[PDB]
């Protein structure tokens, strides 16, 4: 297992180098985002009414990515359908707030749709 791990290690290392060098806004979005703990729960869908799900750990992340009902992700625009807290319980856009953010159950989950 040890030797094959380092294979997979080299292969994964080398992949993000292929990725970095490609330097493309949409990927870099989702790689950088992923680094903050902001990851997709399912396949990013290409279409328009297929649903997207992602985790938002931070109120920062929320601020950087959400703004009213729009969700900026993967170099395209998304329509925040619903948000739920860690407890699987619904959160209204207006509780994800200045002042209230520290009373919420991070991380949250945005189900958005493509524009």
């Amino acid at each position: 297992e040890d030797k094959r791990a380092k294979v997979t290690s080299a292969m994964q290392t080398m992949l993000f180098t292929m990725l970095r060098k490609l330097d493309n806004d949409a990927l870099n979005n989702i790689i950088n985002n992923a680094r903050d703990g902001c990851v997709p729960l399912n396949i990013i869908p290409l279409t328009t009414a297929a649903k997207l799900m992602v985790v938002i750990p931070d109120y920062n992340t929320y601020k950087n990515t959400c703004d009213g009902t729009t969700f900026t992700y993967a170099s395209a625009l998304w329509e925040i359908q619903q948000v739920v807290d860690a407890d699987s319980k619904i959160v209204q856009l207006s509780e994800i707030s200045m002042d209230n953010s520290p009373n919420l159950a991070w991380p949250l989950i945005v189900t958005a749709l493509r524009a």
């Binding site: 993000f16 990927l27 989702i30 790689i31 997709p40």
Partner: protein, 81 residues
């Protein structure tokens, strides 16, 4: 162009998912494969890059699998290589 490169990266991405044992989820792999065939076939860089963002998302959606932060750790300790 770099349409050459997005296609190479995509071949390597599939192979990474491979080595993290995705074929034992006959449907995630189905999606991956198709996402992979789609872009090798792409005739303009856009479609390609778009199907490539979806393919990568599968990686990034896998929990234990890759920790990018730990990856980027070694990325910077071996800046030569």
């Amino acid at each position: 162009s770099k349409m050459s490169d997005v296609k190479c990266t995509s071949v390597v991405l599939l192979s990474v998912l491979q080595q993290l044992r995705v074929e034992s989820s006959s449907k995630l792999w189905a999606q991956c494969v198709q996402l992979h065939n789609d872009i090798l076939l792409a005739k303009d860089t856009t479609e390609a890059f778009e199907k490539m963002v979806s393919l990568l998302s599968v990686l990034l959606s896998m929990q234990g699998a890759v920790d990018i932060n730990k990856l980027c750790e070694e990325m910077l300790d071996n800046r030569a290589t």
